[model samples]
Target: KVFGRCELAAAMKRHGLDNYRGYSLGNWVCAAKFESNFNTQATNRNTDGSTDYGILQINSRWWCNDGRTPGSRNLCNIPCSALLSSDITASVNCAKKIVSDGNGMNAWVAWRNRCKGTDVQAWIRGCRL
Candidate 1:
């Protein structure tokens, strides 16, 4: 079906919220949203205020293994500029695998629901996709 720009934009915003700029910005945005709600600064925090840092939240430990700073794993200390500078889509795609067991959005849906406490179908409608 032929979707208008508004619908497309909403879908793009919703779907591309968390990820890398895919083949197309719209698609990329949509994908990111699908993955992590486009919360570029999204992190999984813990009681002690430690967390996997940033949107497409990367684990500090995993980052250490990846040759990044071990301390960078702490989200509060991770620079927002650093987070914005990374390939969000790629990061989220990686996150998708880690959290979702291969079905990224499926994993994201569960995560989103847990965090948002909103009905999944309601979110879909709310996303206007």
Candidate 2:
């Protein structure tokens, strides 16, 4: 499913992601905005042959298992396809595990490249929390 900024925020809030692990709703929204443009079916194949899947663009090499990544770790223990669905439960849960890692919110390349030091709060502006 494709989502509007506020819509995505509301859905993510329902998923219990607001202020999750020190990452704000804006932070998550900003990351997703740059990662997949709010489209759930988005995918990006890496040079390492692993693909990023879903709106969160989670990597197959270390997080989700896609049955194809070399040396796949499946740290999230979830199928990569699960991340591509409209319901974001699995993606949000997996994201929590990603944050559990040492990098925390920094695990996302989009977060580092587009979100860090920016006005992340602007992402949620005009949206009712």
Alpha carbon lDDT of each predicted model:
0.41, 0.93
> Which residues of candidate 1, in runs, are more than 4 Å off?
1-38, 42-51, 63-87, 100-118
All candidates: CA RMSD (Å): 9.1, 0.8
Ten-residue segment with the worst summed lDDT in candidate 1?
A: 18-27
Q: Write the per-residue lDDT of candidate 2 for residues 35-84, one digit (tens) a residue.
A: 99999999999999999999999999999999999888998989999999
Tell me, by TM-score, which candidate is best: 2
> lDDT: which candidate is best?
2
Error of 1 at 72 (Å): 10
> Residues 27-117, candidate 1, lDDT per residue (tens digit)?
3333344434556556564454444444444555433122334444432333433544334434434443454344433333434445333
* Clash statistics: count for each candidate: 16, 0
Error of 2 at 33 (Å): 0.3
